[PDB]
RNA sequence: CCUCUGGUGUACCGGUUGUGACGCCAGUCGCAUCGCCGGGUAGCUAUGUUCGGAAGGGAUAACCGCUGAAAGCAUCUAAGC
């Protein structure tokens, strides 16, 4: 596996420390916490760390190849973090980010509120765009998904909640 | 379930035909589908009255995912959620 072969690096502030399967990561951003699969073993001399498979089998490379993306995806969150940039199209249809509460307005015929998870921030420079920002990527991207899922694209006009980088497809009547 | 609206209610009240009897008048009783007819207390009862299938947790079906390699990409899945 050629990603199980590839070193993952340490920024600096980050501080990884293996406690048997429970591997912990420290950066500016917050705490992280990974298991290890009974086949990987991680290895962190220097800034590297190296993420070996304990036995040649093809699963054990396959879990290995996981173990790392995971790892670095959790440094990356912890030294700088991501974010989402969701955009809302139609009349109407505005957000809010109000305390820890998002609140929008979709069409219905009444308002919803989403509570962000803890770990998650959100804010609205304009009534039709979010930016959603944090350390865990899968934390991050699920939020997004709850969100965008409350009104989704439309093919005939476009209109709901669409992640920035997404191809929206699109047709007409007759 | 029986407060209300009704049905029934042959041991409750009344009108009335024929006949027989209580010595007779008066007053009553037997029999005639409870003789026939008009009402009707409780109980039972529906066509009458009230109530119920409200709300919420957990695991899921099809389906929709997040992150993610095998397979440097992609991928709901193989680990994990």
């Known amino acids: 596996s050629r990603v199980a072969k590839a070193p993952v690096t340490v920024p600096n502030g980050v501080t990884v420390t293996q406690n048997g399967r429970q591997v912990e990561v420290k950066g500016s951003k ?3 916490s990974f298991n290890l699969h009974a086949l990987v073993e991680l290895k962190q001399e220097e800034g590297k760390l190296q993420l070996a498979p304990a036995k040649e089998s093809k699963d054990a490379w396959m879990q290995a190849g996981t ?6 995806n959790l440094v990356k969150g912890v030294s ?3 974010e989402r940039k969701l955009q809302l199209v139609g009349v109407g249809y505005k957000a809010a980010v109000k305390g820890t509460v998002v609140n929008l307005n979709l069409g219905y015929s ?3 509120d989403y509570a962000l998870p803890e770990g998650v921030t959100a804010e609205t420079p304009t009534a039709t765009e979010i930016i959603l920002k944090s350390a865990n990527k899968q934390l991050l991207g699920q939020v997004a998904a709850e969100i965008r899922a409350y009104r989704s694209p ?3 006009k476009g209109k709901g909640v669409r992640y920035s980088d997404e191809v ?7």
């Open 168 to 174: 929206i497809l699109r047709k007409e009547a007759k």
């Open 80 to 82: 700088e973090g991501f």
């Open 110 to 112: 009444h308002p919803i």
């Open 30 to 32: 917050g705490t992280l």
């Open 154 to 156: 439309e093919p005939y």
């Open 67 to 72: 173990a790392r993306a995971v790892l670095n």
